[PDB]
């Protein structure tokens, strides 16, 4: 644990990026987290929503 001070910085930043990327798998209330599924399934007036 001698160099925990430096490792902690690396770990915190890696964690932040992993979270940022994982959020792209969330729906946020949308029918799908995948943008292509929305465009393929719905006509423009509904896809935009």
């Amino acid at each position: 644990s001698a160099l925990g001070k430096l490792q902690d910085v690396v770990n915190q930043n890696a964690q932040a990026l992993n979270t940022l990327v994982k959020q792209l798998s969330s729906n946020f209330g949308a029918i799908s987290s995948v943008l292509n599924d929305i465009l393929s399934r719905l006509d423009p007036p509904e896809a935009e929503v």
Binding site: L3, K5, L6, V9, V10
Partner: protein, 104 residues
Amino acid sequence: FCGKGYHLMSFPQSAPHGVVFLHVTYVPAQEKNFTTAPAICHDGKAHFPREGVFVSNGTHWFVTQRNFYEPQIITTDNTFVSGNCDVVIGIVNNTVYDPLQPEL
């Protein structure tokens, strides 16, 4: 600021996204008990140490540097005089040697 103890020097080492400092310090060891006094009374005059502190081994008085025990004879060359022996609290009676005396 630069490690525990009395700072002597430091050496940098580089590290991944950071720096490591190796701090070299002086640490006192193996202390001994001595009897002390604020001043020495001689010829009605109060003598104070110029650099160190007055200590006694139980029978004899010496003056030594503060951070390392290295006892020396109390002389006019390592003390200074200020005032008489009436003011200082805890002043003790001890001869102060004058290096010129043996010459004259």
